[PDB]
Design a protein around this ligand. Structure first.
Ligand SMILES: NC(=[NH2+])c1cc2ccccc2s1
Ligand SMILES: [Ca+2]
Length: 223
């Protein structure tokens, strides 16, 4: 996350770190047994880490649970990143408490202009590499589709939306992939892609979760 701030320990209780020997993606806990992340975060051998703040230090509130299965969306296109969403089932249910909680799925899609909270342990420099150990947060509004499409011509589908500042400076970045974009208490997006990070006229592109609620619900009830 570039141009953001330190969240504070466990203030984003639904935030997850996917680890395969090291942290490689973020995710969101939607209920005690399931996590939603980005399909481009797919790997075999994933351990889900809940109640994290510093991911390099066991501070006492963590729960490390292995995944029993991963389900990448049936129509995910790795070339365009269209339908960039994946569900991960935990081998055991997480113990929800003040530090580990689930986030609600949306009942409708949010309006451009709505302010959201984006978080993750990704790079914090636009030009350079600095990976933080504690969770970083960013409040950014959803941009209109017109500004999103003019920034990325022929690349935005109806399953993506842009959030950020066209002036650059604040944005999500690699390492933040799969993480949550929460607006008004609901999970509206998933960190998916962008051109560089915090660049002028290159906002972040997020998977539009409101388009997958039926698929999520149906998939979890049958697995
Ligand atoms: N500009 C951005 N918001 C992003 C850029 C990248 C690049 C790689 C992986 C994830 C992301 S999010
Ligand atoms: Ca830790």
């Amino acid at each position: 996350i570039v141009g953001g701030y330190t969240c504070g320990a466990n203030t984003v209780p639904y935030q997850v770190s996917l680890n395969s020997g090291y942290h490689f993606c973020g995710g969101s806990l939607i209920n005690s047994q399931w996590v939603v992340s980005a399909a481009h975060c797919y790997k075999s051998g994933i351990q889900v880490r809940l109640g994290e703040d510093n991911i390099n230090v066991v501070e006492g509130n963590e729960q490390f649970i292995s995944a029993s299965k991963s389900i990448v969306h049936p129509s995910y296109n790795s070339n365009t990143l269209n339908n960039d969403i994946m569900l991960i089932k935990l081998k055991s249910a997480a113990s929800l408490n003040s530090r580990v909680a689930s986030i609600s799925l949306p009942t409708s899609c949010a309006s451009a202009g709505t302010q959201c909270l984006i978080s993750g342990w990704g790079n914090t420099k636009s030009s350079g590499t600095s990976y933080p150990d504690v969770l970083k947060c960013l409040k950014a509004p959803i941009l209109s589709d017109s500004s999103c499409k003019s920034a990325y011509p022929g690349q935005i589908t109806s399953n993506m939306f842009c959030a950020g500042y066209l002036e650059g400076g604040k944005d999500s970045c690699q390492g933040d992939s799969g993480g949550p974009v929460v607006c008004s208490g609901k999970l509206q997006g998933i960190v998916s892609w962008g051109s560089g990070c915090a660049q002028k006229n290159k906002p972040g592109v997020y998977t539009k979760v409101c388009n997958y609620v039926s698929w999520i619900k149906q998939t979890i009830a049958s697995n």
